[PDB]
């Protein structure tokens, strides 16, 4: 599977140009609700691969992302029972939300915008927005880069 419980997961976005050391620059409130992210993800995933030529590795990799999120929803309920209660059953939701939860939130957005705009458009937005935050203020324009 793509998404993982690992601290520094091997090849998370590498195959699609970008890396986590680039997506990190974007704020946490920028990404929408997880349910809406997955609902609009599965929306394009089904109707594009069939019928092709529209077989893109973006929605193809999304199948290994949505199912791996399902592989966590089934896992979390089982962990918060089989062990103890304090810092064993209550810290299960605390592990996913929001650290592990943010990883999928940004991963979904990355692959969704890749089809909505273009892999290059996203990679360009990711580079230019990072460039915007890095710039020492005042010499930096106040108008932040947008994705449209």
């Amino acid at each position, epitope marked *: 599977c793509l998404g993982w419980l690992w601290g520094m997961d091997i090849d998370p976005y*590498k195959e699609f*140009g*970008a*890396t986590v*050391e*680039l997506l*990190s*620059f974007l704020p946490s409130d920028f990404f929408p609700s997880v349910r809406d992210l997955l609902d609009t993800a599965a929306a394009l995933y089904r109707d594009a691969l069939e019928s092709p030529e529209h077989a893109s590795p973006h929605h193809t990799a999304l199948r290994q992302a949505i199912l791996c999120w399902g592989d966590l929803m089934t896992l979390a309920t089982w962990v918060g029972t089989n062990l103890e209660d304090p810092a064993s059953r209550d810290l299960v939701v605390s592990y996913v939300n929001t650290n592990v939860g943010l990883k999928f939130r940004q991963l979904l957005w990355f692959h969704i915008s890749a089809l909505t705009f273009g892999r*290059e*458009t996203v*990679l*360009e937005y990711l*580079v*230019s927005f*990072a*460039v915007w*935050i*890095r*710039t*020492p203020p005042a*010499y*930096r*324009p106040p108008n932040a*880069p947008i994705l449209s």
Partner: antibody, heavy 123, light 115 residues
Framework: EVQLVESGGDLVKPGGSLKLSCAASGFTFSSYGMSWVRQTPDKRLEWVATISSGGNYIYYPDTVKGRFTISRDNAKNTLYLQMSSLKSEDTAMYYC????????????????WGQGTSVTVSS | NIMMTQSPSSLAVSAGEKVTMNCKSSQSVLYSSNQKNYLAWYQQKPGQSPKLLIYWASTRESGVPDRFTGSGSGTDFTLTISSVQTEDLAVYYCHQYLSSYMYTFGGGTKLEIKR
């Protein structure tokens, strides 16, 4: 193999115009931002302009803004520099450079440089 | 404008010796969010265009010999060649890429061979 080939360099009278071209090969040109860096006779390296992968974001230093225009044609795999109101202090070797940030992390500065085209601004 | 200063302007070393060249930025190039220094080192051999050596102040580019080492943080940085080869005859420049809205380069240090 990454190759950047600049052309267009010439003797131009002060106040004149010149258009530099850079033909890029051995990478997905539309995935990388490109820049121009000039090297003056004192051997100092000076950033001239940058243009994002798509041609959407353009950046200039105070020395060149309003006189130079960076552009690209992702269909011809070419980077351009339209210079106007040329002055003697614009005399330098002009390098076409590929921005590396586009490969993955922000860690990457400009990685490949071309061979350059010399521009002489003189009467 | 973050001005980059390089010292010495030039230095002569004998093959096999260790070399240290310094770079000073007018203001910090350390991110504090990334906790990464936005400093690069380029090598320019005679009759050639520059080639990227080091980025993030300490990380070597793909294909860069182990003898090249970058160190420092904030405003003070160094490039170390331990030990020198005659092939290492070049002008070494430092570059800050924090800004990107106004990229700057150091004046360069000219490495000459003692014989």
């Amino acid at each position: 193999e990454v190759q950047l080939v600049e052309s267009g360099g010439d003797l131009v009278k002060p106040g004149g115009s010149l258009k530099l071209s850079c033909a890029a090969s051995g990478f997905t040109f539309s995935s990388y931002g490109m820049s121009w860096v000039r090297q003056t006779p004192d051997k100092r390296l000076e950033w001239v302009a940058t243009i994002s992968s798509g041609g959407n974001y353009i950046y200039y230093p105070d020395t060149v803004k309003g006189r130079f225009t960076i552009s690209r044609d992702n269909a011809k795999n070419t980077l351009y520099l339209q210079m106007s109101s040329l002055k003697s202090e614009d005399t330098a070797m002009y390098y076409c450079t590929r921005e590396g940030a586009y490969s993955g992390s922000s860690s990457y500065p400009m990685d490949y440089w071309g061979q350059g085209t010399s521009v002489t601004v003189s009467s | 404008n973050i001005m980059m200063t390089q010292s010495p302007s030039s230095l002569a070393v004998s093959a096999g010796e260790k070399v240290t060249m310094n770079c000073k930025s007018s203001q910090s190039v350390l991110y504090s969010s990334n906790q990464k220094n936005y400093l690069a080192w380029y090598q320019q051999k005679p009759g050639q265009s520059p080639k990227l050596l080091i980025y993030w102040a300490s990380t070597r580019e793909s294909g860069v010999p182990d003898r090249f080492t970058g160190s420092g943080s904030g405003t003070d940085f160094t490039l170390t060649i331990s030990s020198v080869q005659t092939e290492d005859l070049a002008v070494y420049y430092c570059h800050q890429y924090l800004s990107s809205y106004m990229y700057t380069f150091g004046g360069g240090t000219k490495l000459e061979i003692k014989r």
